[PDB]
Design a binder for these strands. Sequence first.
DNA 1: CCGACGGCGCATCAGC
DNA 2: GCTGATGCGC
DNA 3: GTCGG
Length: 326
Amino acid sequence: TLNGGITDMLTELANFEKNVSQAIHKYNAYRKAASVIAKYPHKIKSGAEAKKLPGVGTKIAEKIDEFLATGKLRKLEKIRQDDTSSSINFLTRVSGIGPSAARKFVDEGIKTLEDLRKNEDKLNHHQRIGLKYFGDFEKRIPREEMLQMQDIVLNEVKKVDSEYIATVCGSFRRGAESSGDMDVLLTHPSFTSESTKQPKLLHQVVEQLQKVHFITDTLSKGETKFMGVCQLPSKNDEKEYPHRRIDIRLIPKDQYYCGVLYFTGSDIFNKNMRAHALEKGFTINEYTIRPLGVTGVAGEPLPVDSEKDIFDYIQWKYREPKDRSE
DNA sequence: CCGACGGCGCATCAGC
DNA sequence: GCTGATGCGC
DNA sequence: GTCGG
Ligand SMILES: Nc1ccn([C@H]2C[C@H](O)[C@@H](COP(=O)(O)OP(=O)(O)OP(=O)(O)O)O2)c(=O)n1
Ligand SMILES: [Mg+2]
Ligand code: NA
Ligand code: NA
């Protein structure tokens, strides 16, 4: 909020390069600088002052100078005018529609919300649902609602099997007063890093959550991952609650610490961490942390009994979830 | 001053 | 059907 | 786009 201007701008360029140009790296490089500048405790009064921070080279330094002076960015103004580019940007705002399929829709004439509605037969299942709820999916979930969702997820999970453990990670675990979606990490003793004693472990909780009408729809669903839609029950005469996005990851009981580390994010944080890990000589995934051998090859999984053990290996002083919102 | 750039589950399509 | 590259997401 | 080899 201190440098809302500069951050917002760079966030926009990021979407452009990601959606239109299909430049994932330029996308990443643009948002990293968004985070560092957002973290920066001073109202930046110069593109030079900005270049100092990591992830902020000279291009972004020149843009920051322009923005500071004019109040706008010509490069961004022209992208807004360009009907094709600003037509893809909109399609990607639908879960299931990435940079490619969006560009493929422009090439077929499908460019607006009403075009997708009439050509629903052109969309795959995920895109179809992403469209159906598109309106709702733009609305952020307040903490109060997040809490009510926690009870239901946990209380239903317990009813299936008491040995289950569900952890609402994401922006929730980071103490955000508002979340984008609902990320739910799940563990059960029957599923560990070398032995699986029960085939339908995730199917059980999903099925249950559906039977209680909490899980309205199902985007994707594997045996360890689930993307879907849920919605808090409503009272009488009250307008229904917006349908919400709910991810449900099932990590092996013994790898929890690595799993929660990931599912807690933020993604920028995980990127900056796994990058640094790689520099320190380690590769951190949502499963384990391993050494990068002598030939670069990832060695055997190192022992972790807490989140801190991970920060320790890479020589990073521990940081609470409330401080991982980058 | 030229390129590399965190990691992975599901869904989907291609070649066999 | 199985293997792998590719979209798209978290 | 940035930044390190
Ligand atoms: N490419 C990515 C994207 C996300 N994540 C992490 C960051 C999050 O902790 C979690 C996914 O959660 P969300 O995508 O729902 O986003 P957040 O929960 O971080 O924020 P919010 O939902 O408030 O927008 O996985 C990651 O490691 N790599
Ligand atoms: Mg989330
Ligand atoms: Na810099
Ligand atoms: Na999308």
